[PDB]
Amino acid sequence: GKTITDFSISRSVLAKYEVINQVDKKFILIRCQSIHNCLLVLVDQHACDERIRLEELFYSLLTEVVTGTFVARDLKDCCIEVDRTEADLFKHYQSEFKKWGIGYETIETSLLEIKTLPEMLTSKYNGDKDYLKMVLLQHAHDLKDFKKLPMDLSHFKLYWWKYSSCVPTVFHEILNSKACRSAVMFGDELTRQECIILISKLSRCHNPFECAHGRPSMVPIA
Template identity: 30%
Template sequence: MFDLKTDVNGVLDELYSAKCKNYEMICPILLPLGINQASAITFSKHIFNEITVIGSVDKKFVVVYAKLKKLLIIIDQHAAHERVRLEMLMNEYTHQEIEEVTFKQSKLKKTIPLKLSSDEVRCLSSKDVNNHFRKLGVSYNLQGNCMDIVAVPTCLYNNVFENVDTEKDKLLKLFVSSFIKEEFDFLKNSRCFSKTIPNFLNKIINHEACRGAIKFGDVLTTEACQNLVQSLSLCKLPFQCAHGRPTMVPLTNMRKMPPKVERQKVNLKKLKAL
């Protein structure tokens, strides 16, 4: 007896698998990456040479395709722009030489007086300490137990004068005294000069980079996405935002079926007999 149910299913299975094979020849297969696989993929700057921008997704991410690695990658639009801005601001606010970063300074119209302990006066009288603060953008004169600040780091100055509406002088004094206190504490505890950028200035520049960066929810045209990826490719550390979060993450591996795939024949006799 002709078993319609079994045969129909058989024919459909054959048709389906034949169709699938055809599609697999032209469509990439999506292989979602597990957490372990994704974290095993490391990016180097060469990745930017093989990237094609696809476009913006959900007003949050830029999707790109890395042709050689066959990876679909998402770029966090805020984190990426924050990194671009951070490196731009570091260039604007510092002179960077091979092993030394010197902060540019802004001269004050009105000096800021700070009272000091005798320990602090002794410390600040040293030529090396004076030099150290000068490299951080702070210039001062000592008068008795008072420190007269005549110049401050430009990043700190701009942060107060460009973003605060009232009590700018008061806020600047608070910022400068906190910064100097932090440096004193470091000198006291470590008994050496730090070679890295002080936390206080780092935070200020990171904050400025974040504040002016593209946000989630901002609409990016394809051209804006391309410009963002291009700017990111020119960064020294393109794979982390100012706060250390990744700027780009592999989403999925895309590969095509190997070229030699035998196509299954559809049983047309069975199909006609239906």
């Protein structure tokens, strides 16, 4: 049994780090024997909290989707005009859309009758049938163009990150925004205990080295 040794090194680094204290109400200064590629690192507090929050948000969504417990609010009188090919595209992926709480029926120039929407998307679309059309088309084209693979529910712990790519962009964007808004900000007061909990939780994240929007969460200063 052979494994790529470089994947294990990155994870073990942050696990061997002690918190110094908050710096300028914007960072958390941390400190790392056996120094191959690991001393002083400045962690962006907002990016740190946002990262913990996002992975918690992704884990929730995917556990809900996998187990078939993803809430789908009933939508009344919602019909959108679609092309012949667009009506065919939706007819094909109707089963795949149902996995995300997007329940609809294809009628017939043609039309799209949305019966259900997940509360997450019901809130975002906010009665805009054009936004809802653009967003469903976006995912349908992603599936078609192999830019996003379908959800494999043929499997009976849960690793959300092994189903992370399957998440439609619209949901990805929504969760990024929720994480960002709920996250601690620059200028906010953090106690050493608060900093310890944040860095402890961040080290338990699948990807601790970047925020929700793909920018770095920490910078080494030594």
